[PDB]
Amino acid sequence: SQIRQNYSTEVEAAVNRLVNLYLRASYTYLSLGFYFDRDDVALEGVCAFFRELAEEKREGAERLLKMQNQRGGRALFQDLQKPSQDEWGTTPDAMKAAIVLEKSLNQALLDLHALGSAQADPHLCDFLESHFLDEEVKLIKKMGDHLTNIQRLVGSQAGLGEYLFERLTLKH
Amino acid sequence: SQIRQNYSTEVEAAVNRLVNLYLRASYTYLSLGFYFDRDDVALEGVCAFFRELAEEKREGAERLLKMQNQRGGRALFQDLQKPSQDEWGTTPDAMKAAIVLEKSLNQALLDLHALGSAQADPHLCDFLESHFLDEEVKLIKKMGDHLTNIQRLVGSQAGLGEYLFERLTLKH
Amino acid sequence: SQIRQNYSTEVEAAVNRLVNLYLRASYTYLSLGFYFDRDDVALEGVCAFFRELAEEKREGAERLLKMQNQRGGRALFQDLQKPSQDEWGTTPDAMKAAIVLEKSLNQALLDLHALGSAQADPHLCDFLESHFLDEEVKLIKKMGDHLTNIQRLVGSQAGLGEYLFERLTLKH
Amino acid sequence: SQIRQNYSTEVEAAVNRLVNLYLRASYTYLSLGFYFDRDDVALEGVCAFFRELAEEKREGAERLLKMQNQRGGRALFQDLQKPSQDEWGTTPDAMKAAIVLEKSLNQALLDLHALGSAQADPHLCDFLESHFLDEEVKLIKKMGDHLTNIQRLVGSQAGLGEYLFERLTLKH
Ligand SMILES: [Pd+2]
Ligand SMILES: [Pd+2]
Ligand SMILES: [Pd+2]
Ligand SMILES: [Pd+2]
Ligand SMILES: [Pd+2]
Ligand SMILES: [Pd+2]
Ligand SMILES: [Pd+2]
Ligand SMILES: [Pd+2]
Ligand SMILES: [Pd+2]
Ligand SMILES: [Pd+2]
Ligand SMILES: [Pd+2]
Ligand SMILES: [Pd+2]
Ligand SMILES: [Pd+2]
Ligand SMILES: [Pd+2]
Ligand SMILES: [Pd+2]
Ligand SMILES: [Pd+2]
Ligand SMILES: [Pd+2]
Ligand SMILES: [Pd+2]
Ligand SMILES: [Pd+2]
Ligand SMILES: [Pd+2]
Ligand SMILES: [Pd+2]
Ligand SMILES: [Pd+2]
Ligand SMILES: [Pd+2]
Ligand SMILES: [Pd+2]
Ligand SMILES: [Pd+2]
Ligand SMILES: [Pd+2]
Ligand SMILES: [Pd+2]
Ligand SMILES: [Pd+2]
Ligand SMILES: [Pd+2]
Ligand SMILES: [Pd+2]
Ligand SMILES: [Pd+2]
Ligand SMILES: [Pd+2]
């Protein structure tokens, strides 16, 4: 009331937690991007890749929040923890951290989906599938591809490999 | 036969009942629209809003019927009950009636979805989600927004509020 | 080294703190925007106003971070505190909170400027002036104008006033 | 007289010295560019990079000279010392020399700025900031980025690294 229908308090809470996770991921990507722009790191294509991901994660959080309002739920925001590292190592280190991060979001989506199914909320299930689950699978595949490529490159002409990957994959 | 597959008689019947509900809702909106065009009511933006909804509900019924034929089911039509009122009061009265009506359609969709799930008809589930459930949530949110706005306006310069809402929200 | 010149550790730290403040302000505006989109609040022009400000504050933080890298400093991120409220009251309440927030950013800029001057960092001084100080003054004037208008409107036909301001100022 | 106002003889002299430094830097870049075009060096992208910088430094000197005339001061030219080397080594050697050179110009700008501040010449301060200090910071960041990239590349497939950097960064 006035609009809320078939929308459990459990799903509402889980949506707010998922928003926090997406915003945390956005923040992590922000840090990753600026790290690669340091004068002693200087890989612009890596910066650009992570900046784009920062945007995508913020967009995901905003989509969740709009959905929360559309269903008559109430957005509740919590502190956003700072990212897990201050310095992110080399390109393969960063790509590995990103995959870990996306898999964690993907698992949260799956957990929310199960909740929605358990709550007989078929509409949430359809909202998650068409707007989040498919994007995560595609993203994780791209990241895995990138990691395989960078790993193949840095074994074992590491500096050269890192430069070529940035120039010929990421700057493309 | 020749085409019907995984399509229960229970789902077929429920689809025919849902068509009747959508057509009844279309009829209700038709009445709502013409009521607002009465010379002693005269709120054209309210008429236009309800006319559009009459169209949307008829389109929903037609989509259901096409789906029924696509699955090899058989459309069966019943009497369409006249709308619940002959006169619809003020704008907030009408908006309230519309929300009640849409929530009832939404609940029928959810009930059909449960049936489809219980009948292991995963394709129906996907047809309902992508084409009906999402539209209902969006519509009900817009209606709730409209009701909040009109309520804020008519407490307590009612005539003035009703005119402004029609001019600046509905005629937009 | 390799590039850092005339860039004190004090200024570097103050820049990182200012980034945190800008990102916190962005988060606050995010919350403000979604609050106004609640079905029981429903003022889209107010949502849009705060969404734009969320974007502007994130852009400010990003400009500071790029500057930090350009000077050879190192970005360090901290936890982002959640916004001061979960519910933001009426339009004038929200506008008041926004002015308080911007004045706080403005004062942080002035404090950083003083630091830069004290550190004989004339280039920072010029970066802050041309890219942050002028924007804050303009923004605060717009906010003050909005607050004066909304205050004039809600004394004392509050609901009506709030609607008109959203329609005729914010939706413009 | 007829126009000179708030323009000290100390600032006038310092401006003439800064012109000499900018023109010397232009000359150094001229030499750097032609060195990379030697048939036994043959890195056209490196030549082009330094040619552009030669142009930028001459433009800076000309801007200073126009400013000197605008303020009613008198341009005085001195001998331009030849560049510090006749042969410039490899790409990282040259990039290092360029950074040393730009940092020296940057420090001269900062020294002139301090003078201007000490002379209560707020207009000079604004001329230097908006037209010279910002450009130097941006330039030095680009140079530092280039040096980090080339260093990463030439450790330790030096010839290969030098070619790739010229083709994929400088020729871009
Ligand atoms: Pd509600
Ligand atoms: Pd960057
Ligand atoms: Pd970048
Ligand atoms: Pd970037
Ligand atoms: Pd939804
Ligand atoms: Pd499901
Ligand atoms: Pd699902
Ligand atoms: Pd490119
Ligand atoms: Pd058949
Ligand atoms: Pd009509
Ligand atoms: Pd009409
Ligand atoms: Pd009409
Ligand atoms: Pd179908
Ligand atoms: Pd299903
Ligand atoms: Pd379904
Ligand atoms: Pd009109
Ligand atoms: Pd450095
Ligand atoms: Pd919104
Ligand atoms: Pd909105
Ligand atoms: Pd909005
Ligand atoms: Pd700067
Ligand atoms: Pd200053
Ligand atoms: Pd300043
Ligand atoms: Pd408009
Ligand atoms: Pd003169
Ligand atoms: Pd050349
Ligand atoms: Pd050349
Ligand atoms: Pd050239
Ligand atoms: Pd001047
Ligand atoms: Pd000054
Ligand atoms: Pd200055
Ligand atoms: Pd080319």
CSV table of N, CA, C and O in Angstrom, one decimal, chain A residues 75-79, chain C residues 24 27-36 38 81-101:
chain,number,residue,atom,x,y,z
A,75,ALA,N,14.4,1.8,-0.3
A,75,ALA,CA,15.8,1.7,-0.3
A,75,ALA,C,16.4,2.1,1.0
A,75,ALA,O,15.9,3.0,1.7
A,76,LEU,N,17.4,1.3,1.5
A,76,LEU,CA,18.1,1.6,2.7
A,76,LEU,C,19.6,1.4,2.3
A,76,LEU,O,20.0,0.3,1.9
A,77,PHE,N,20.4,2.4,2.6
A,77,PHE,CA,21.8,2.4,2.2
A,77,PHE,C,22.6,2.2,3.5
A,77,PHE,O,22.3,2.7,4.6
A,78,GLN,N,23.7,1.5,3.3
A,78,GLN,CA,24.7,1.2,4.4
A,78,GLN,C,26.0,1.8,4.0
A,78,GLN,O,26.2,2.2,2.8
A,79,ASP,N,27.0,1.8,4.9
A,79,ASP,CA,28.3,2.2,4.6
A,79,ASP,C,28.9,1.4,3.5
A,79,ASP,O,28.5,0.2,3.3
C,24,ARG,N,31.1,10.8,-0.8
C,24,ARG,CA,30.1,10.8,0.3
C,24,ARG,C,28.9,11.7,-0.2
C,24,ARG,O,27.7,11.3,0.0
C,27,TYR,N,26.9,10.0,-2.9
C,27,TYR,CA,26.1,8.9,-2.2
C,27,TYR,C,24.8,9.5,-1.6
C,27,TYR,O,23.7,8.9,-1.7
C,28,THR,N,25.0,10.6,-0.9
C,28,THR,CA,23.9,11.3,-0.3
C,28,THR,C,22.9,11.7,-1.3
C,28,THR,O,21.7,11.5,-1.2
C,29,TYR,N,23.4,12.3,-2.4
C,29,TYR,CA,22.4,12.7,-3.5
C,29,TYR,C,21.8,11.5,-4.2
C,29,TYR,O,20.6,11.5,-4.6
C,30,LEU,N,22.5,10.3,-4.3
C,30,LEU,CA,21.9,9.1,-4.8
C,30,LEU,C,20.6,8.8,-3.9
C,30,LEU,O,19.6,8.5,-4.4
C,31,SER,N,20.8,8.8,-2.6
C,31,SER,CA,19.8,8.5,-1.6
C,31,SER,C,18.6,9.5,-1.8
C,31,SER,O,17.4,9.1,-1.7
C,32,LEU,N,19.0,10.7,-1.8
C,32,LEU,CA,18.0,11.8,-2.0
C,32,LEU,C,17.1,11.6,-3.2
C,32,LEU,O,15.9,11.6,-3.1
C,33,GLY,N,17.8,11.2,-4.3
C,33,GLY,CA,17.0,11.0,-5.6
C,33,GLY,C,16.1,9.9,-5.5
C,33,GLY,O,14.9,10.0,-5.9
C,34,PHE,N,16.5,8.7,-5.0
C,34,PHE,CA,15.6,7.6,-4.9
C,34,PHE,C,14.5,7.8,-3.9
C,34,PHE,O,13.4,7.3,-4.1
C,35,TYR,N,14.8,8.5,-2.9
C,35,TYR,CA,13.7,8.8,-1.9
C,35,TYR,C,12.5,9.6,-2.6
C,35,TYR,O,11.3,9.2,-2.4
C,36,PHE,N,12.8,10.5,-3.4
C,36,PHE,CA,11.8,11.3,-4.1
C,36,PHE,C,11.0,10.5,-5.2
C,36,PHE,O,9.9,10.9,-5.6
C,38,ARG,N,10.0,7.4,-4.5
C,38,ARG,CA,9.1,6.4,-3.7
C,38,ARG,C,7.7,6.7,-4.1
C,38,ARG,O,7.3,7.8,-4.4
C,81,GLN,N,30.9,6.7,4.3
C,81,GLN,CA,29.9,6.6,5.3
C,81,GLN,C,28.5,6.7,4.6
C,81,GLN,O,28.4,7.4,3.6
C,82,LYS,N,27.5,6.0,5.1
C,82,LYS,CA,26.2,6.1,4.5
C,82,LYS,C,25.7,7.6,4.8
C,82,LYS,O,26.1,8.3,5.7
C,83,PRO,N,24.7,8.0,4.0
C,83,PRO,CA,24.1,9.3,4.2
C,83,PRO,C,23.5,9.5,5.5
C,83,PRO,O,23.1,8.5,6.2
C,84,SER,N,23.3,10.8,5.9
C,84,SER,CA,22.9,11.1,7.3
C,84,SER,C,21.5,10.7,7.6
C,84,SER,O,21.2,10.6,8.8
C,85,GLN,N,20.6,10.6,6.6
C,85,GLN,CA,19.2,10.2,6.8
C,85,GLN,C,18.8,9.1,5.8
C,85,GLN,O,19.4,8.9,4.8
C,86,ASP,N,17.8,8.3,6.2
C,86,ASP,CA,17.2,7.3,5.4
C,86,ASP,C,16.0,7.8,4.7
C,86,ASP,O,15.6,7.4,3.6
C,87,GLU,N,15.3,8.8,5.3
C,87,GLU,CA,14.1,9.5,4.8
C,87,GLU,C,14.4,11.0,4.8
C,87,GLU,O,14.9,11.5,5.8
C,88,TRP,N,14.0,11.7,3.8
C,88,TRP,CA,14.5,13.1,3.6
C,88,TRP,C,13.4,14.2,3.8
C,88,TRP,O,13.7,15.3,3.5
C,89,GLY,N,12.2,13.8,4.2
C,89,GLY,CA,11.2,14.7,4.5
C,89,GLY,C,10.6,15.3,3.2
C,89,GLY,O,10.3,14.6,2.2
C,90,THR,N,10.3,16.6,3.3
C,90,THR,CA,9.7,17.3,2.1
C,90,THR,C,10.8,18.0,1.3
C,90,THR,O,11.9,17.9,1.6
C,91,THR,N,10.4,18.5,0.1
C,91,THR,CA,11.3,19.3,-0.7
C,91,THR,C,12.1,20.3,0.0
C,91,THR,O,13.4,20.3,-0.1
C,92,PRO,N,11.5,21.2,0.8
C,92,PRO,CA,12.4,22.2,1.5
C,92,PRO,C,13.4,21.5,2.5
C,92,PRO,O,14.5,22.0,2.7
C,93,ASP,N,13.0,20.5,3.1
C,93,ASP,CA,13.9,19.7,4.0
C,93,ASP,C,15.1,19.3,3.3
C,93,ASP,O,16.3,19.4,3.7
C,94,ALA,N,14.8,18.7,2.1
C,94,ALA,CA,15.9,18.1,1.3
C,94,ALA,C,16.8,19.2,0.7
C,94,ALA,O,18.0,19.0,0.6
C,95,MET,N,16.2,20.3,0.3
C,95,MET,CA,17.0,21.4,-0.3
C,95,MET,C,17.9,22.0,0.8
C,95,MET,O,19.1,22.3,0.5
C,96,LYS,N,17.4,22.1,2.0
C,96,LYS,CA,18.2,22.5,3.2
C,96,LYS,C,19.4,21.6,3.4
C,96,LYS,O,20.5,22.1,3.6
C,97,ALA,N,19.1,20.3,3.5
C,97,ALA,CA,20.2,19.3,3.6
C,97,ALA,C,21.3,19.4,2.5
C,97,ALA,O,22.5,19.3,2.8
C,98,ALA,N,20.8,19.6,1.3
C,98,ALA,CA,21.8,19.8,0.2
C,98,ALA,C,22.6,21.0,0.3
C,98,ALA,O,23.8,21.0,0.0
C,99,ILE,N,22.1,22.1,0.7
C,99,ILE,CA,22.8,23.4,0.9
C,99,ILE,C,23.9,23.1,2.1
C,99,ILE,O,25.0,23.6,1.9
C,100,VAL,N,23.5,22.5,3.1
C,100,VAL,CA,24.4,22.2,4.3
C,100,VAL,C,25.6,21.4,3.7
C,100,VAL,O,26.8,21.7,3.9
C,101,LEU,N,25.2,20.3,2.9
C,101,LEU,CA,26.2,19.5,2.3
C,101,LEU,C,27.2,20.2,1.4
C,101,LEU,O,28.4,20.1,1.5
